[PDB]
């Protein structure tokens, strides 16, 4: 059964698919080893904050637990990198309280996509720069993230990074328990700092999760060849057998 020239169309389609796939894997592998570059470049600033935030012996539990911050990408083909975080979020919101309460900030369309239809939205972030996340326009989110305090005690949701592509989703928390007495300046510069680091590790995941999801596809696509190469040969055979049988059977007729 089936065609031949319809088996070629499939092979070549698959091939050009594997191509485009493996392209992006390498491309997203090129965006892992630039995540360090902006990961490193942030190593010092973090050190020289906890060193400052050494904490004198001389805002603890205020009232509630309210808003979240949910880190993602705008682009797809990342494996579950999105759905996962967008699960914990959706769980420990509805595992939380069930009024229209418990509010939200999202980074990357894909997040805002689900969050939108569900309700409880607060802010927006689109077009993060990819491997180089611009520390700048995340600074506008620290402001919204803090000044929002209209708020109490936020948690941040994203994926961590351990060794190339292997990763896991987390809730580290932040806005609680870890001139003179200038907290008006450390409170802010300690959130701007965390929401940022969160990204670098988020993105590091993104590219990774994509680097892989674009391997799984490549690898799989490559198997689609085997499954077709086989059905092509078979249809290559029955065809060359029918053609011949036709050419002889038309001679014996003479």
């Amino acid at each position: 059964m089936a065609s031949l020239r319809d088996i070629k169309t499939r092979i070549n389609a698959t091939k050009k698919t594997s191509q485009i796939t493996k392209a992006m894997e390498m491309v997203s592998t090129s965006k892992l080893n630039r995540a360090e570059q902006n990961a490193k470049s942030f190593v010092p600033y973090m050190e020289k904050i906890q060193e400052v935030v050494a904490n004198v012996a001389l805002v603890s539990r205020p009232v509630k637990k309210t808003g979240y911050l949910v880190i993602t990408s705008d682009r797809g083909l990342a494996g579950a990198y999105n759905s996962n975080v967008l699960r914990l979020v959706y769980q420990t919101i509805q595992r939380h309280a069930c009024p229209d309460e418990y509010a939200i900030i999202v980074i990357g369309r894909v997040g805002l996509s689900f969050f939108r239809k569900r309700n409880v939205i607060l802010d927006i972030t689109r077009l993060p720069d990819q491997p180089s996340f611009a520390d700048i326009k995340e600074i506008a989110r620290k402001t919204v993230g803090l000044f929002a305090d209209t708020f109490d005690e936020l948690y941040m949701y994203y994926n961590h990074y351990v060794s190339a592509i292997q990763q896991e989703v987390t809730e580290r928390k932040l806005l609680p328990l870890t001139q003179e007495e200038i907290l008006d300046v450390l409170l802010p510069q300690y959130a701007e700092s965390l929401i940022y680091g969160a990204l670098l590790d988020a993105k590091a995941s993104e590219h990774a999760a994509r680097m892989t999801a674009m391997k799984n596809a490549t690898d799989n696509a490559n198997e689609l060849i085997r499954t077709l190469t086989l059905s092509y040969n078979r249809a290559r055979q029955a065809a060359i057998t029918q053609e011949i049988t036709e050419i002889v059977a038309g001679a014996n007729a003479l």
Binding site: M1, T17, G76, L77, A78, G79, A80, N82, S83, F114, A213, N216, A217, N220, A221, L224, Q242, T245, A249, A253
Partner: protein, 237 residues
């Protein structure tokens, strides 16, 4: 055939059960060679078509008596393009095309939900309610069919929150299309079921209408009336 033709033209309605009408045409080619005939496509008898025409129309109901016939049609090498079953198609008012794929899926009877047809599917025959569901099922089964290459390459991750739903329904609908055949039991050990038409029509409605979008697939596998699915559902935990 002549047997059934008796009760039809000499007296009542008749059920003609012909098991593998293929073997007729098949044996045909066996002789066609020795007759000194010019072989046709695939090496079949140059008369294959007509030889079947002269034995089909005979199996028909008249103003005298009625003949409801059900014929088993073997598919050589799973090729529906083979002259035997191919040529046979234009001989039936209703077909049930069985697929090996669906069979290994565990879907029994393994019946193509998008291939099998009947002249009955008309609103002018089966009623509107039964019609629209009919296509509704097929619609969502096809929409799942198209999606399959992506799933097979990219998994379900990059599908929309709308296409995913269609993947669930479709599956569970393609599973509910499985049935317990009384002539099974001795093997599997399950008893069996005859699902009334009103209950099939309804069962799928709810599924398309989403009363069941919570129940896992496996619950819908190998059952009768839709109620049973709910039963076998809780049994799951």
């Amino acid at each position: 055939l002549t047997m059934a033709e008796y009760f039809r033209d000499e007296q009542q309605d008749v059920l003609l059960f012909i098991d593998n009408i293929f073997r007729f045409t098949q044996a045909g080619s066996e002789v066609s060679a020795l007759l000194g005939r010019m072989p046709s496509a695939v090496g079949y008898q140059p008369t294959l078509a007509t030889e079947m025409g002269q034995l089909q129309e005979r199996i028909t109901s008249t103003a005298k008596g009625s003949i409801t016939s059900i014929q088993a049609i073997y598919v050589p090498a799973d090729d529906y393009t083979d002259p035997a079953p191919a040529t046979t198609f234009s001989h039936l008012d209703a077909t049930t095309n069985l697929e090996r794929k669906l069979a290994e899926m565990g879907i029994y009877p393994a019946v193509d939900p998008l291939a099998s047809t009947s002249r009955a599917l008309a609103p002018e025959i089966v009623g509107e309610e039964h019609y629209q569901v009919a296509r509704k099922v097929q619609q969502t089964l096809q929409r799942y069919k198209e999606l399959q290459d992506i799933i097979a390459i990219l998994g379900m991750d990059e599908l929309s929150d709308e296409d995913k739903l269609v993947v669930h329904r479709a599956r569970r609908i393609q599973f509910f299309l499985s049935q317990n055949f009384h002539v099974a039991e001795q093997f599997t050990g399950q008893p069996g079921s005859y699902v009334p038409v009103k209950e099939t029509v309804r069962g799928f409605k709810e599924i398309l209408e989403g009363k069941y979008d919570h129940l896992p697939e496996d619950a819908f596998r190998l059952v009768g009336r839709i109620e049973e699915v709910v039963e076998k559902a809780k049994a799951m935990g």
